[PDB]
């Protein structure tokens, strides 16, 4: 059993219809190169608006139900027979989430995951927009594979990757929007970013796909212009954490890698780390401060 | 710029003759409509006297089924004629169950369904617990032609949980038909300021406007222990999304209160303030207890 | 002076002996229904499986084939004519065949002759003399109420009368009077068993707890059935009765006479009393999930 | 006649409005029961004072006390232990801002086995309990005592076949109901005593378990917010057997100590053979989780 | 060839009227099966005593015992753990006032994995089980053991294609049915043994899963409420492969230990290839939720 | 010996790839069954030609014909009326965009009582039938004939206990299964597996069961060249305990005959008690494919 996976990497305008056209073009290119599952970067419908903390930007969110972009990519998924996770800004009554809908290769909406770990600070004021997610970590049975899909900042947390692996994830996927930080040009996070994820692939023995944005974006914030340069470096890592495919920090790209899932599942079983785990000794992971279990 | 809705609170006196009272309600709904109202709110159990001063066998038989209710049917025609949303408070019989209920009539005349009062008051003057099963619909929101609304009934208005329950389900405006006044056993009790402050609190905590329609007049009821009298204190009002009173009636005048709200701007304001973003349902399990320790079954 | 307002309904319990010939027993039933109507009855209740002997003392292959379809049943059709002629409601107990299922059933015939539908016995008894579990699928209609020309009524069958759940289910759905056609007597394996006082008390409790009148019609006479292991005899103990909404017996027959019991109820006064007593206002269904278990712990599927 | 035997007792007495006097009365009659061989002794509802629920008064709510270190429960634990008798203790419970009509079950070694909180709360003239008590949130309970597994509910609960069935399904071998019922002050023509008995006899017969009801006697005048209100409590404390037969009964004015012995092994065998529990149809009982016969409650 | 192999066994013996004797007989035959390589061993229905259901007797109901701390289950857990063998244990369960014909599945490490309660209850002369057992309320279950996911149901359940299909759908790799079937005391012309085998062979073949049936032998006479009643149990315990072929079978009168090995990975692959499960039409099977071919049950 | 008696027959023959010839063969064998007293006679599946269904050829699709005015059905109606026999007629149905593997039930007076459309269609490696047939949408049916209430299902339907139970719950007194099964002239021989599953249905439902299978070798040229199947016959009739009462071999024409007392069998079915004892409250999992999620 072999599945072909793709990371896409492109620049966005602040127009939904242009960006969706761009995603469609790169999804067809992926499909043309053999892709069964194609990963589109985080909040690709527009500019990464979380540089600002603005009332009007919250109203960019849309219900999960009858979402125009999801609906449009469901047609594309269906035509091509590819699996397409769709990053979007969800409104759910008065709650708001950074969410992702998993469309199967028959175009079926398989359900959503809501971003669990919400980043904060200059350039990435996501805590202002999003309730911390309440779906918990999830795995989706698609026509090709059980996949673990989480979102951007979730990729820094070994807990997220481990939870998806424990629930049957054969591949992990992280749509991303990370770049420079507007308050401090000396912060270059790209190597650190890659290393943490490489760690998750190696610790769980599962391949991993990260799709990140490129281009410079200037946002009109409540305190004036703020600029981020997104550094791309979209990549696909194998089950021991080796980078098999990688983009640069400036050019549009379509990454492709094939994995033998039944072989990798045998290596995983045979390595035996899941049977060697000591959940009896991991209670402290349910604390924040190293002592008090959360309610 | 944005969806506007004009809401109205009515305030009037009742006899114990249904036809008279429905006629009074119609006159005032028409008057609200003439002043631009899209949703009009009539006070609790308006079809007669506030009979719950007594605990009487014969008064339980004032209840009628929800199905083919002559007062709901009559007000459905008016709703349709005028293009206004009309919540209709009534005493519901449902086989051997009885409830203090409200049917939400949409602006096309459609009966959108019912809510059954959840929190039932008790004590001299207000012996509701004798008459009504505690409601079993739970808190509801209704999609009307003009807005998603949350409607609850009188005593429900004291409970922050009801208001929050409706808001979490997308209610854009909260409505509470009311019957509250003096208390026949103790003339020193004057609850009007307390009553208003608690509702203002709900409007401000959920960032939604709130409408409260209360009775006026003195009513004398024969009870098992002789006459009992309540002076209903009016003070019907409409509050905006920070809990500010935008319109209020006094304690004796018949009144038609009118207010317009921009539901898109308020939505935007509600979200921006951030309370719904910041709620901690993981820490709210104690709210599912009565005694602060034991969760109910 | 005017008498007190409200819908009055006159109900009747019949009590008679059966042969094992269908034509004879239907003739007996018609005779007693007519006598009940002559005494003012609006609703008349015939005992369980009146078409024949209480054959359930045996577990026999050939007795299963006494069952007949509900559709075009000759006894139901005949009693429909009588109901229409007299203007009386008549529930008709019969052994139902429904493809390969079999039930102990009752068809409710309205005062205009209309077949309102059926109830299938839910609780099926077992044991020497009363081997009903061999014959009947447990019923699958659930507890029902029927709107007749005179009243909304709840009808269940024999062993159902021991279950408070059945009486409450019918009352919660607006039953104004409860009816139980019965066949109960001695038990052939042990002559010390005399259940008649126990039997009455349980049903009196239903009437009192739901504040609705209750009618029980039971068989009389001795019947001997040829069983797979020899002859078996039951003496049916009569004691048909009508109870009011506090569980008081307003009329009762003895253990051997043929009887036509008659009582009038003001259903509007009773409804008022039922509601004022307050039990239905005070019920706690949030605490009753355990009733959906058999063993006090595990909810059934 | 082999089998585990248990002797139960219903007590019936008049109350003053002084706790000390009523607790002394209860102790006297518990000792009289024990002298007659009783293993489990049932004291009537809210026996610490007058039946105060004729009134709806602010100050009466403050008669409530916490379950923890309750002076009357602690005193009766001493007696339970001294005599080797099981004693359910009815009390008015405060639990932060909630209030309940409650009963603590004291085992024959003095151990406090836990509480049941009254589920069905009556209302109306003379019996304004809904003003005082949150509807109970323990659900129906059974308690394993030294002598038997028992089901204890409280007064108005005794009208509900659901409560009796719920306790029996959980293995209750005997049902107990402390009571306060009498005349009704707004209508002198109401005499509920025969109705009250018939409904409980029904529960005993339907579940094939014995049942004990202890009820108050005497006239009580309460100063209500609208003037004097009077109830004459009608006694009629009784013990019913597993077919609903009254085996012992008190009249409507006498102080009484009723006594009956039950063979719990034989009764268990009878209950099972009669077959009602074998034949129940919980798949058809979902309408019991409605109030109106149609909508399941949340 | 390659893949997870499992050795299963059907045991067949005659019962005495003494519980401990009968458990010792079971232990002896379990040990003999283990010696021949068995991983999962099936003991016949209600093996602790005579098949008492010929009678409808009050005292026989009290032969039931709770699942909790059941002395026969506890004893067989020790054997399971000692030998590393999976052992389903048939017993007569008391659960407050409910009673069931039940089976506890003991894993090869001695762990009590839970119980299944007999769903379909037979009736008629000689087999009056409806008098004793509530219809089961666990539903059909599959248990994950150290060696396989197994589906265990009980005697009469074996006539119902629905039970076997329910277990296969939930992952059962082997079906097991402890049995007590023989002659019928009211009609000596009834010989059901060929019919009995054919129906089970049909389940194995329709689901492509092996099937194990363990039945009693011996003549048993029971004192019924109407005199002596005799059943001659007919043995014919057997093991069927995934196309329904009988691979091992006992006769109608001797003790037997039957043994068969199955390659569960090859059978699984063969079942997936055959594709019947992906070809099923559940959208057309709603009539199966009726008894009468028309009205769905509640 | 009292009660309604019905004589049923299973026919078995080799198909040529010529329609007239095959219908002539069917008529000859129906007449022979009638001569031996048969009241209801079962002809094997798709008997008008070679079993084309696993060859995936677009030109074979035009063999389908509408249910309305079907020349083979209309001809067998005449035969049914002439002889006073019930004849289920297997045919390849064209229904607008859809195509089905279907069977029309002809009563003893020649009346067309209706159609059943094969429900279970094998898809995945080895079985490419979807190329020709849509999954049936009639659901499982019973038909009241002059002699009996009967249930009929087709070929692959044979493997599914649900179809047999569904028919019996609705009052079918006899089950009929026209089939076509064989193998590559391979090691696996499915004939015993097949019989055991069917004997299971008869025994579990306490109804007799009639199965008609073809014989002979058939060669079809396909996209992937010549495919050959040897059909293994073994048509049979089973009684209500699953006992085989007559059976054909794997190479000759056969006319199998058996008489059933439908009143006695009904009484036996009811007394055995399985239908009294069924637990539909516990069967919801059967409305899933994966053992957890109900289908729409
Ligand atoms: C996505 O937007 O969560 N990446 C967050 C990066 C935060 C860097 N300080
Ligand atoms: C409406 O009737 O619920 N108002 C109740 C007020 C109670 C005052 N103590
Ligand atoms: C009717 O037939 O159900 N009465 C059942 C009585 C059973 C007595 N043990
Ligand atoms: C106890 O106190 O609940 N008694 C209730 C009686 C109410 C009479 N209508
Ligand atoms: C086990 O006891 O279920 N076998 C029942 C057989 C009944 C025979 N008619």
XYZ file of C-alpha atoms in Angstrom, chain C residues 97-102 137, chain E residues 159-162 284 287-294, chain F residues 139-143 149-153 160-177 198 200-209 240 265-266 269-270 274-276 278:
68
model
C -51.172 -14.572 13.977
C -48.925 -12.101 12.134
C -46.863 -14.000 9.587
C -44.595 -16.054 11.869
C -45.108 -13.936 14.930
C -47.983 -14.597 17.406
C -44.032 -13.050 21.192
C -30.155 -21.148 15.785
C -30.133 -17.420 14.901
C -28.165 -16.168 11.891
C -28.556 -12.650 13.328
C -32.446 -3.340 2.638
C -37.445 -5.829 8.051
C -35.030 -7.752 10.391
C -35.920 -5.223 13.134
C -39.517 -6.544 12.988
C -40.939 -9.691 14.455
C -43.968 -9.768 12.127
C -42.463 -8.734 8.799
C -44.147 -5.267 8.972
C -35.720 -4.987 -1.629
C -36.570 -8.569 -0.664
C -40.023 -9.609 -1.729
C -42.633 -12.349 -1.308
C -45.267 -13.199 -3.848
C -46.447 -17.525 -0.709
C -42.910 -17.678 -2.143
C -39.671 -15.831 -1.798
C -37.187 -15.606 -4.665
C -33.699 -14.200 -4.696
C -26.748 -13.731 2.704
C -28.767 -15.042 5.679
C -30.435 -11.627 5.829
C -32.207 -12.189 2.502
C -33.583 -15.541 3.496
C -34.741 -14.201 6.928
C -36.230 -11.107 5.318
C -38.397 -13.293 3.024
C -39.504 -15.696 5.786
C -40.485 -12.812 8.131
C -42.853 -11.655 5.415
C -44.537 -15.057 5.136
C -42.537 -16.886 2.421
C -43.280 -20.605 2.685
C -40.686 -21.702 0.137
C -37.449 -20.030 -0.966
C -36.150 -20.178 -4.567
C -32.615 -19.374 -5.650
C -28.199 -22.685 1.705
C -28.495 -23.160 6.772
C -31.139 -20.772 5.432
C -33.698 -23.595 5.072
C -32.988 -24.846 8.616
C -32.868 -21.481 10.335
C -36.108 -20.337 8.810
C -37.877 -23.750 8.748
C -38.870 -23.401 5.119
C -38.049 -25.557 2.131
C -35.526 -24.205 -0.374
C -37.322 -27.212 6.374
C -44.357 -27.256 7.880
C -46.001 -24.010 9.095
C -41.896 -23.766 12.085
C -44.097 -22.153 14.714
C -37.318 -19.316 16.550
C -39.705 -16.616 15.292
C -41.261 -16.314 18.760
C -36.164 -13.400 17.866
